[PDB]
Every structure is written in structure tokens, then in C-alpha cells.
Design a protein around this nucleic acid. Structure first.
Ligand SMILES: Cc1cn([C@H]2C[C@H](O)[C@@](C)(COP(=O)(O)OP(=O)(O)OP(=O)(O)O)O2)c(=O)[nH]c1=O
Ligand SMILES: [Mg+2]
Ligand SMILES: [Mg+2]
Length: 539
DNA sequence: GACCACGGCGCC
DNA sequence: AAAAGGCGCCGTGGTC
């Protein structure tokens, strides 16, 4: 490639080097561009940003986020990572994509710009004729990256002072619990080390080991094991409570406050677009898709996520969505009827599990029932199921058989999906997003059957994810015009931020965009709440 | 100071 | 732990 003075012609491909992986926190070390056998290197990266109309190339969204941070409206365009991910979702890094489609991910901006141009040419080649994947790239992924760049640059407000104070309280509680554990053990040890804890529990206290760890075959001290040992010794309960508190403290309460960005005063995650095997997004640095919600302390942490002053959060969450998707994909009449009658399978299982009326079921019960409903659907064993409901194995088995006989066509769809996956080497969502599952023909049963569970889950989970992505693409422009903001996506949920005066109107509109994203054989319903914090907005 | 594998566990 | 699927981050232990 011939050297050429900055700036590049229009439609050139950018390369850029960051001091670190997080766009919002990174120094832009270099910027380059390449077009028609040329490479232009920017003498000064930051100012050189101003000369671009579009971030076009590998990891375009990241450079776009960094541009937004500097007050520049530089939207992301074509990105070869998105083409590769669509061809095969195991294409998740530029290191791999480069090696696979004609180059090498280096640490120099010019070489990255050139790699972007080459990779785009080649990958675009692979996608000619793949009309459904092309529809996904133009109508969903490429536009979605623009939406994601904005969400990343916006961030969410956090109640820092509140978390600081909460930390001090939980610290004292943790001290009480570890002091108890050591007294019962008859000596101190690192309660954080599951190796040391294993020795205390199963060698010194001589408790019955229940399970082994996967890789190294040690005696497990997992929550499930400890739960089966609640009655066997007083120390077990204290260890479980200790685990809850230190998990929440070390993962959320302590780290989060230190991640408030100086410029924005807000908390910024990354929304990874080519990270999962099913087509879902992931979130990292920090992960804001796994903020606690289940337990009392978890809920207090969720309360820390608040709206800007004079604004409200709007939380919208698809109802029983993967079950609705499954009704459509499978064509099961009984299942479709359930949704056309406005029934609620999670609530129905909850009232059965806890032997209470439908009206007596609370949120924690329903959430319990959800892990049961999806667990069983995607292949949970009778033994495990019996352990979690704490019912006899025989009853666990009856639950699973009635579950599937209640919806006859589901098992048929599964078998059809696996057969097709064996012939073609891949399975696909409603929109033709693919996941290759070669192990469908493994000669080892356990490997083969693990692959089968991955294979028939993918169309379901991936269609739900397709729907949300499309809903976000349709929704974003409508929010901009109303002066509202899109903050987070948590798979089948969206968290927005609206001026108080317009929160109500924004909520109704978002609900309708999401419900009408793409009509199915069953209605899509969206539960929506409004509130000053994330907890309040979900009900 | 940085890797990693591992067990473990938070959420969807 | 166990035939649920999909993620990312924690501390420990071990290494470089
Ligand atoms: C808890 C859980 C979730 N999911 C999946 C399957 C599911 O449809 C979703 C897309 C969203 O989760 P959700 O909103 O909590 O639940 P629903 O949408 O089904 O119902 P509502 O409460 O919203 O009415 O992730 C699992 O695969 N395993 C799990 O343990
Ligand atoms: Mg939902
Ligand atoms: Mg949800």
C-alpha cells in the first residue's frame, strides 16, 4: 500500500489502536485509513477523528463510542466482524477472523486499516447469495451497532454514596459469618478458598461429599451441594450466607463505584455484538446484564441504578418470550392456545411448586418457577429436577413427562430440528441466523447429547434475541425524537431513561414498538414499569 | 505486575 | 453435583 497524506477519501476503512480495550476509558494511540490501494496515517489521532464521516471497519463501534465520548457524531458503518459473525458465530475475535479470512491482527493502525479493507472484500464475497444473512446484516446488525454505540457512550447513573455506605454494613455482617464459621470449624482458614473449605468440610468435620468438580475431580462445595447438606451441620448454613454476601460485595458493591467515568459521571458498559453462539448480545467491563435482583441484598444493589434528576427509568420486559417463540416455531396448538388465552405458565408452575393459589404466587416464587420451566424444556434430568424441587425422583419424572405431553408438537419440533442439523451441519433461527453444531454426530453419547441440547436451544434463544435486536433498531429513532434515551439491554428487557413529563408517553410507545416488532402465531406481550430506580421500574 | 484454569455464581 | 441453554467476573492457586 502506497503512503498518502491524511485525510483519506470518503468511504475509506479505518484502523485504530487503543491504549486499552474499553472505548470509554481508552487513549487513542493511532488512527489510519485505507482506500484504493492507499494508506493514510493521521499525524495526530484525536484531531484526525474530526475528518471522518463514518467509522468503517473492524471494531467500528468501539471507535464510534470513543468519538461520541469526545463530542463527535461519528456513526459506525460496515464492520467485517459482523459479516464473519453472521457466517459463523464462533467468529468472535478479530485475531481469529483475520487468520481465517486473509490477514493478521497486528497492533499498528495502518496495517489494521488495510486488513479491514481486505477482510471486508473477502467476507462480502462469502455472503453473496446468502440473502437471509444479508437481510440480517443490513436490517439488524449494522444499524444495531449504531444504537449500541450510543447506549455505551450514554451510560447509566449510579448512587455511589449509597453503595459506599452499603459496603461498610455488609463488611460487618461478613465478619459475623466468618467468625461463626471458624468457631464451628475450631480454627481459622481462608473461607474464600474452596480447597481449604473442602478439607474442613469433608476431612475434618467428616461430612458426606455429594459431588465432584468437572476438571480436577475434587469434592464440590457448590451451593447445590451445601444445600443438600443444610441439615447435616450448623456450619453449612453460615457458609451459604457467607457466599451470598461476599459474592455481592466483591462483584458489585465494591467495584462498581470506582468505575464512574470522570467526564460523564456515569457508569459505562460495553455491549458485545459478536460474542455469543446464539445471537444474543453480551455485556462486559462491567457486565450490567447480571446485576443482582433475586435476594434482599441483591435488590438493595439494584436500587443503586437510578435516573438522572428530573428523569425516570422505564423498564420493558418481554413476557415469557422464549416460550412464545417456541409456540411459533413448533406450531403446537395447546401452547399457542395458552398464549391466546393470556395464561401464564411461569405462574402456573409456581402455584404447583409452592402449593399455593395463582393469586398467592409472589415474584420470588415465579422466578423460581422460571428456572424450572426453561430448565426442563432444554433437557434437565429427573434427578436434578427432583433435587431442586426437593421431591421424590419419581415425581420429578412425572412432572417432566406431563410437561411435554401437554405440548405434543414441542418434542416433534426438537427432533425435526436435530435431524436437519445433522444433515446440514447447522441449525438456525426464524430469520436464518446460523450456529454450526458438528458434534451432532459425535460417537460418544454424552458429547453428542450435549450438542443436541445446544442445537435445539439455539433457534429458540436466538429468535428471541433477533426480535429484541430488531425492536431496538425500530425503537431507537422514535426515542431520539421524544428526547428519551436507551440505556441498557438485558436480553429480553430494555431500560430507558425519559424526562419525567414524557416517561408515561415513552413507556406506552416503547411497549407497542416491542410488541409489534414482528407478529407471530402468538401475541408478544411486554410488561412495562416506570420508576426512579431500576428496582422500582420493574415493579 | 500479567497470564491462565478452575470452581463458583450473578443474570437472562 | 445431576442431560437445561447462553453469558462475564470473582478469588484462589499457580506460573511467569
Ligand atoms: C430466568 C431464566 C430465563 N431464561 C431465558 C428464556 C426467557 O424467555 C429469556 C429470554 C428471558 O428471561 P425472563 O424475562 O426472566 O423470563 P420470561 O421472559 O420467560 O418471563 P417473564 O418473567 O419476563 O414474563 O431468557 C432461561 O433460559 N433460563 C432461566 O433460568
Ligand atoms: Mg421476560
Ligand atoms: Mg427479562
Amino acid at each position: 500500500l502506497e503512503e498518502a497524506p491524511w485525510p483519506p477519501p470518503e468511504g475509506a476503512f479505518v484502523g485504530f489502536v487503543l491504549s486499552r480495550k474499553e472505548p470509554m476509558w481508552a487513549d487513542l494511540l493511532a488512527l489510519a485509513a485505507a482506500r484504493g490501494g492507499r494508506v493514510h496515517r493521521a499525524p495526530e489521532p484525536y484531531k484526525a477523528l474530526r475528518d471522518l464521516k463514518e467509522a468503517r471497519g473492524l471494531l467500528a463501534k468501539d471507535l464510534s463510542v470513543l468519538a461520541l465520548r469526545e463530542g463527535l457524531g461519528l456513526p459506525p458503518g460496515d464492520d467485517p466482524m459482523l459479516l464473519a459473525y453472521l457466517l459463523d458465530p464462533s467468529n468472535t475475535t478479530p485475531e481469529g477472523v483475520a487468520r481465517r479470512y486473509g490477514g493478521e491482527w497486528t497492533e499498528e493502525a495502518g496495517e489494521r486499516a488495510a486488513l479491514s479493507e481486505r477482510l471486508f472484500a473477502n467476507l462480502w464475497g462469502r455472503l453473496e447469495g446468502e440473502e437471509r444473512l444479508l437481510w440480517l446484516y443490513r436490517e439488524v446488525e449494522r444499524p444495531l451497532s449504531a444504537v449500541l454505540a450510543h447506549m455505551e457512550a450514554t451510560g447509566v447513573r449510579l448512587d455511589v454514596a449509597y453503595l459506599r455506605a452499603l459496603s461498610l454494613e455488609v463488611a460487618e455482617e461478613i465478619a459475623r459469618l466468618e467468625a461463626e464459621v471458624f468457631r464451628l470449624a475450631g480454627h481459622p482458614f481462608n473461607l474464600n478458598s474452596r480447597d481449604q473449605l473442602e478439607r474442613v468440610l469433608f476431612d475434618e468435620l467428616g461430612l458426606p461429599a455429594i459431588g465432584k468438580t468437572e476438571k480436577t475431580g475434587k469434592r464440590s462445595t457448590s451451593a447445590a451441594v451445601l444445600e443438600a447438606l443444610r441439615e447435616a451441620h450448623p456450619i453449612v448454613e453460615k457458609i451459604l450466607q457467607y457466599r451470598e454476601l461476599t459474592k455481592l460485595k466483591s462483584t458489585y458493591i465494591d467495584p462498581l463505584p470506582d468505575l464512574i467515568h470522570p467526564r460523564t459521571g456515569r457508569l459505562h458498559t460495553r455491549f458485545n455484538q459478536t460474542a455469543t453462539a446464539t445471537g444474543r448480545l453480551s455485556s462486559s467491563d462491567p457486565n450490567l446484564q447480571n446485576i443482582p435482583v433475586r435476594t434482599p441484598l441483591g435488590q438493595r444493589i439494584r436500587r443503586a441504578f437510578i435516573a438522572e434528576e428530573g428523569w425516570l427509568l422505564v423498564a420493558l420486559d418481554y413476557s415469557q418470550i422464549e416460550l412464545r417463540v417456541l409456540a411459533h416455531l413448533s406450531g403446537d396448538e395447546n401452547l399457542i392456545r395458552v398464549f391466546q388465552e393470556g395464561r401464564d405458565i411461569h405462574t402456573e408452575t409456581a402455584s404447583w411448586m409452592f402449593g399455593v393459589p395463582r393469586e398467592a404466587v409472589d415474584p420470588l416464587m415465579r422466578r423460581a418457577a422460571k428456572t424450572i420451566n426453561f430448565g426442563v424444556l432444554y433437557g434437565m434430568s429427573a434427578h436434578r429436577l427432583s433435587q431442586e424441587l426437593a421431591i421424590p425422583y419419581e415425581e420429578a419424572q412425572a412432572f417432566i413427562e406431563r410437561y411435554f405431553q401437554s405440548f405434543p408438537k414441542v418434542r416433534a419440533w426438537i427432533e425435526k430440528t436435530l435431524e436437519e442439523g445433522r444433515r446440514r451441519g447447522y441449525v438456525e433461527t426464524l430469520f436464518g441466523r446460523r450456529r454450526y453444531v458438528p458434534d451432532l454426530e459425535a460417537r460418544v453419547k454424552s458429547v453428542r447429547e450435549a450438542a443436541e441440547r445446544m442445537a435445539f436451544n439455539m433457534p429458540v434463544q436466538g429468535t428471541a434475541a433477533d426480535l429484541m435486536k430488531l425492536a431496538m433498531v425500530k425503537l431507537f429513532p422514535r426515542l431520539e425524537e421524544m428526547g428519551a434515551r436507551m440505556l441498557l439491554q438485558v436480553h429480553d428487557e430494555l431500560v430507558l431513561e425519559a424526562p419525567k413529563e414524557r416517561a408515561e408517553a415513552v413507556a406506552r410507545l416503547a411497549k407497542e414498538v416491542m410488541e409489534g416488532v414482528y407478529p407471530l402465531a402468538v401475541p408478544l406481550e411486554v410488561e412495562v414499569g416506570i420508576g426512579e430506580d431500576w428496582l422500582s421500574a420493574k415493579e
